Amino acid sequence: DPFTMTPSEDFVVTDRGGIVENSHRVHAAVVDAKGRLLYALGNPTRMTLARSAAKPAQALAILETEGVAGYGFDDADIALMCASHSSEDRHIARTRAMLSKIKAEEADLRCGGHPSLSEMVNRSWIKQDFIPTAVCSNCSGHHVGMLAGARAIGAGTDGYHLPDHPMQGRVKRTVAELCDLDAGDVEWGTDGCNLPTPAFPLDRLGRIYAKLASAADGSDAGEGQSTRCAALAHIFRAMARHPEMVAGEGRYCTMLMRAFDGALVGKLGADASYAIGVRASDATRQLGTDGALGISVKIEDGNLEMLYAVVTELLERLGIGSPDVRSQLASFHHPQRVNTMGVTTGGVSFPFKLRGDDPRLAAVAR
Amino acid sequence: TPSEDFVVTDRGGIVENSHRVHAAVVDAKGRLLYALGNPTRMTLARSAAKPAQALAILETEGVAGYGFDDADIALMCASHSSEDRHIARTRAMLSKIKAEEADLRCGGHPSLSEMVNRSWIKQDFIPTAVCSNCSGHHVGMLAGARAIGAGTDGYHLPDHPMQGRVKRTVAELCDLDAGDVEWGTDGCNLPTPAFPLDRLGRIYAKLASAADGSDAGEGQSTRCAALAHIFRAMARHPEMVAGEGRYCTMLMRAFDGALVGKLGADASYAIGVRASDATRQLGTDGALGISVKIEDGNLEMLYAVVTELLERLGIGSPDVRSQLASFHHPQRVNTMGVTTGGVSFPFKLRG
Numbered sequence: 001d002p003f004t005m006t007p008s009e010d011f012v013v014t015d016r017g018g019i020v021e022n023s024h025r026v027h028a029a030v031v032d033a034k035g036r037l038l039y040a041l042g043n044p045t046r047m048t049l050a051r052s053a054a055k056p057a058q059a060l061a062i063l064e065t066e067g068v069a070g071y072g073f074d075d076a077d078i079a080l081m082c083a084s085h086s087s088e089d090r091h092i093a094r095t096r097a098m099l100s101k102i103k104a105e106e107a108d109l110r111c112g113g114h115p116s117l118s119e120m121v122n123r124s125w126i127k128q129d130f131i132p133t134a135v136c137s138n139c140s141g142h143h144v145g146m147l148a149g150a151r152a153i154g155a156g157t158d159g160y161h162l163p164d165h166p167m168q169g170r171v172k173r174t175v176a177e178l179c180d181l182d183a184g185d186v187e188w189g190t191d192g193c194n195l196p197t198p199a200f201p202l203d204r205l206g207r208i209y210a211k212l213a214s215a216a217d218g219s220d221a222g223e224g225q226s227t228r229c230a231a232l233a234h235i236f237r238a239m240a241r242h243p244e245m246v247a248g249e250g251r252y253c254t255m256l257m258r259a260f261d262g263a264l265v266g267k268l269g270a271d272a273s274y275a276i277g278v279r280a281s282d283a284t285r286q287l288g289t290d291g292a293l294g295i296s297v298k299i300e301d302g303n304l305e306m307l308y309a310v311v312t313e314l315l316e317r318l319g320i321g322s323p324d325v326r327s328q329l330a331s332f333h334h335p336q337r338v339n340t341m342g343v344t345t346g347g348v349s350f351p352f353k354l355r356g357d358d359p360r361l362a363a364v365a366r
Numbered sequence: 367t368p369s370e371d372f373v374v375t376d377r378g379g380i381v382e383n384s385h386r387v388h389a390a391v392v393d394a395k396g397r398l399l400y401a402l403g404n405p406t407r408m409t410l411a412r413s414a415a416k417p418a419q420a421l422a423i424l425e426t427e428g429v430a431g432y433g434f435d436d437a438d439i440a441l442m443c444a445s446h447s448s449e450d451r452h453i454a455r456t457r458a459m460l461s462k463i464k465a466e467e468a469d470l471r472c473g474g475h476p477s478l479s480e481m482v483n484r485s486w487i488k489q490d491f492i493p494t495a496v497c498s499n500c501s502g503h504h505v506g507m508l509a510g511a512r513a514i515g516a517g518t519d520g521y522h523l524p525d526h527p528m529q530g531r532v533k534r535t536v537a538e539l540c541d542l543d544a545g546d547v548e549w550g551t552d553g554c555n556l557p558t559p560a561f562p563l564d565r566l567g568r569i570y571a572k573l574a575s576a577a578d579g580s581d582a583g584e585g586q587s588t589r590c591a592a593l594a595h596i597f598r599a600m601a602r603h604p605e606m607v608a609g610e611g612r613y614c615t616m617l618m619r620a621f622d623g624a625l626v627g628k629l630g631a632d633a634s635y636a637i638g639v640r641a642s643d644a645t646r647q648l649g650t651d652g653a654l655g656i657s658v659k660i661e662d663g664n665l666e667m668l669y670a671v672v673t674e675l676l677e678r679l680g681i682g683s684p685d686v687r688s689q690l691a692s693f694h695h696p697q698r699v700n701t702m703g704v705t706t707g708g709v710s711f712p713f714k715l716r717g
């Protein structure tokens with residue numbers, strides 16, 4: 001019965017010959033520039049570890065640290081501070097360039113190597129028996145930013161990654177401020193790169209990216225801006241102009257931002273979160289808001305292939321982009337289900353229902 | 367009405383991911399003894415149905431003349447890691463039936479073992495049909511085709527007599543009518559069945575029950591005798607069923623003949639447990655079957671839940687199950703060696 005559909009039924013499902021294989025619960029929030037909730041799937045206020053979808057907010061703490069401007073970080077450097085890069089050689093090279101700009105060494109990094117986020121890079125590493133190091137971390141440009149901030153204020157580079165360090169005090173404050181949350185409403189764990197990483201309600205992730213895109217609109221319009229809005233507009237512009245620094249070739253974030261060519265930024269969080277800040281457009285206005293928009297997504301079970309499918313389907317349902325823009329993401333939207341002899345064995349479907357109904361139909365966030 | 371049963375991973379006490387678990391524990395006739403989630407969930411068994419499909423091969427007239435041995439039969443029940451020793455046995459079995467690799471209708475794929483696949487990548491190796499994790503099963507299907515004079519071209523299509531036999535045999539083992547088993551196409555290009563999750567447990571209860579009756583000298587039909595043979599072959603050659611470091615191999619080695627277990631792609635699992643003090647404490651006087659499906663398809667979580675289930679059920683000693691400790695509580699350690707989180711099992715088995 002379609003007249004009693006509920007948030008708890010918001011799934012992305014794969015099939016084999018029409019028989020259900022796997023299904024994945026979806027949570028999504030679409031918010032305006034003040035964080036007002038416009039559309040939802042699942043539980044839009046789910047307490048969620050943002051993971052690297054929080055890196056642009058952490059990068060604002062770096063950019064607002066007195067003295068950092070003196071180092072001459074350029075837009076590509078700042079995109080790398082916002083990144084989960086593929087450890088391509090240009091990412092490793094830019095990390096070494098940034099270390100030189102602040103006169104630090106790779107031994108000053110407290111993040112660690114891992115297998116590349118790109119299969120193609122990993123394949124090359126395997127052939128050469130290469131063991132990744134700190135400078136290869138997908139979060140290396142962010143760790144260099146944190147080192148830069150520590151040096152700028154005279155705090156010292158030892159322990160920049162620890163919560164008692166002044167840089168982490170600044171990060172924690174800035175994240176809660178961008179979310180419009182009290183400190184006790186943001187929880188903190190330890191990330192794969194060994195930095196504190198925040199958790200907060202999923203819609204406030206959307207809220208951070210609606211503020212990024214709104215700042216981009218204020219800047220493009222020539223409006224006087226606070227130092228913070230100017231810094232948010234700089235982050236937006238850096239990500240959108242250097243999206244390959246944010247991820248890498250073949251990566252969803254890079255292909256999404258190239259496709260939209262300035263109209264939005266997007267960023268992955270590990271274990272299948274996603275965030276998008278959408279500049280004001282005919283599409284946002286048709287959706288019922290006069291400003292910018294933020295979108296945030298979490299796949300409950302952590303599946304990345306399903307995340308990219310769902311995010312792409314969500315952009316289509318919200319009317320964001322053109323069929324031709326979004327067709328650049330078609331391999332993510334409808335993942336190949338082809339067996340070892342080249343026969344198509346099934347596919348992906350999206351039995352979820354965006355909600356903004358009989359008044360008696362309860363939408364219990366689940 | 368199924369309850370909400372999850373395995374949950376956390377980072378610092380904060381929920382990261384959660385995975386819905388379905389499980390059925392059944393006795394030798396298939397009566398439901400304990401459950402998680404929806405124990406009758408319609409579920410693609412994938413390679414957890416390989417032993418049942420292998421019974422069709424073993425029951426085919428003339429197949430006994432090829433001289434397949436127990437390790438060979440274990441390969442027919444396998445999702446092996448494409449180790450060089452699995453490749454060699456696939457070629458050996460092709461020689462017993464006078465076939466060649468071109469006769470195979472499965473395709474190569476990245477190895478189920480990460481270590482094997484990195485070895486292949488380092489050497490620019492392109493896997494072929496003989497490397498398929500289901501190669502031994504395909505060689506069995508070729509064997510049955512040749513045995514009845516069916517012709518080896520198209521042994522994998524539903525209208526081939528071998529597939530007619532497989533289709534009929536799966537439903538019989540499940541105790542289902544033909545129309546209660548649904549069929550899709552597998553990664554290896556064979557038909558593959560879907561049926562209620564509890565019937566998967568039932569198949570494996572029948573495997574273990576046949577082993578019990580064989581070990582006791584009982585009046586066994588030809589079918590029970592072959593089910594017993596399948597159980598013995600898997601328990602005696604668990605490295606053919608999977609490979610080094612693989613959960614099924616380590617589970618079966620740990621238990622040393624008391625059970626068999628088998629993985630299904632997209633995170634199904636089946637165990638047939640021979641009658642024991644453990645099963646008697648669980649309230650049944652014969653063998654027992656266990657089947658499990660992680661709704662979202664996560665394998666790490668599957669292995670964790672299966673081992674937690676063995677512990678809840680008291681199957682094995684604590685010493686035996688501690689051999690699976692790395693699967694039971696997967697590592698949650700970051701790139702700098704710091705423990706960042708863990709796995710929890712906030713569910714209760716319902717009886």
Ligand SMILES: NC(=O)C[C@H](N)C(=O)O
Nearest residue numbers: 051052084192193269270
């Ligand atoms: N892209 C990511 O979310 C990576 C994550 N920040 C980590 O270090 O584990």
Ligand SMILES: NC(=O)C[C@H](N)C(=O)O
Nearest residue numbers: 412413445553554630631
């Ligand atoms: N292990 C498996 O279930 C493999 C599966 N039978 C396939 O061919 O895709």
Ligand SMILES: [Cl-]
Nearest residue numbers: 338339345553
């Ligand atoms: Cl497939």
Ligand SMILES: [Cl-]
Nearest residue numbers: 192699700706
């Ligand atoms: Cl981690």
